[model samples]
Target: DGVSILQTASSGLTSLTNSLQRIRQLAVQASNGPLSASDASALQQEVAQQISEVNRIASQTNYNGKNILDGSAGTLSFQVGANVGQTVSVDLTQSMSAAKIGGGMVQTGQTLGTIKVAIDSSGAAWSSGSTGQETTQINVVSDGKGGFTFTDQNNQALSSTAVTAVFGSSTAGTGTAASPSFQTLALSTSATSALSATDQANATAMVAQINAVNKPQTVSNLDISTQTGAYQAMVSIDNALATVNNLQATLGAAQNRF
Candidate 1:
């Protein structure tokens, strides 16, 4: 009975191996398929006929983002059992961005009249009804002409009139534990995980409202450069997306052996 079970399991493995072999063949052909050449004189002609199959194979062969043949999925593991009582366990843990955790607070407005910036998203920023601490300091300097010089958040004096110290940008708007899942991943994994799309979108919305305080209705005047912190928040969001894509790539690099 033990021998029979072994054979049965081996047969399954063999079948899987056969499938893997097909995958391997396709991968090889796609990546490094043989070149054709009818004769020494037809080198270019023959070579041209052999189209590169690598990209096609790489894109098509996907076992839950794991390429069992080509080594994009990274490491793998297998479990083997001889009988109902005797067994060996293998663990295959791939590098993945875990799901986000917790509810995210979306800040959807900027402090008007001498903008005030907050360090933390909570407390003064998204504390339901309390205004948070302002981290940035702006000083107004009088210009020789008619207006005043604008001092930046960094205290660097610039040649501009009426310093508009943008202490903090608007808050990332609030979000539930559902879509965007950026905060959920952070809570499940590490809190230091940077803000995600859910955070950025909410913040951008708030900033839009903040920017709207004195903004013109038309697009021409509202072209108000995308250099705002709201735009920077978007930049952060794109970075997170890139991180997710990298995780996808890592998942794609694995080879399934079991």
Candidate 2:
């Protein structure tokens, strides 16, 4: 019975994905040519219809009445193992709506939220932020190894050795990337201040880099009436396509687990 539930979700996702694909096609077509009032409105009419259909299926497809695509179904946990704490979570929270599609998780061009950087008298660098507050961006935790572990806004674990190198210290526990600054780290343990002014500047610059990613753009209401509006349709549709395809991948991976 549970297997069929997953299957139904997979089917619903396919329909949604195909719907987005056709919307993207219309957007691409509208971008290339000139249009009169009737022509532009005609294209927009179809776009509106498609968007309504997205909402229709999203609300209609339900897992025990939990609407998976409307952001109501946040994360579905399935126990797959007998071992303690053995479980898998299926994420189905990204809403499929005109105003909220193409959003919900770590986007391709996501920017760094507010982050505060400081260098203490200990000559150590640390960062706390509006971004990493929830570990959505970056967060630090005690690695239980006498050193701290950090996860960047990229959600990748901050490298232990690389972070140690950043502090001009010996080895630290190795984990992941070092691109984003520490979520809640002090770069502790050194008697003398370790990070230099240049390091501080670089750390600040690193936040700037993270901010450089392409943030998500909503497609709920795009105007295809003018040439300019038509161009926007292409932009948002492409981004929306990426989001849909990404969600599709999420569902596909979940199905593979089945």
TM-score of each: 0.20, 0.53
CA error at residue 96 for candidate 2, angstroms: 1.7
Clashing pairs in 2: 98-220, 109-213, 109-214, 109-215, 123-193, 137-153
TM-score quality measure for candidate 1: 0.20
Residue lDDT tens for model 2, 166-194: 34453233322212122222333331133
Candidate 1 residues 1-258, lDDT tens each?
A: 223322332332333333323332332333233334333224322222221122233233445444432334444333444556443322222221111110122222222222223322231222334353322323333221112233335555422221121222211222332332111100111111134556545444443443433221211111112223222222222332343344334333322211
In model 2, which runs have C-alpha deviations exceeding 4 angstroms? Answer: 103-217
lDDT of each: 0.28, 0.54
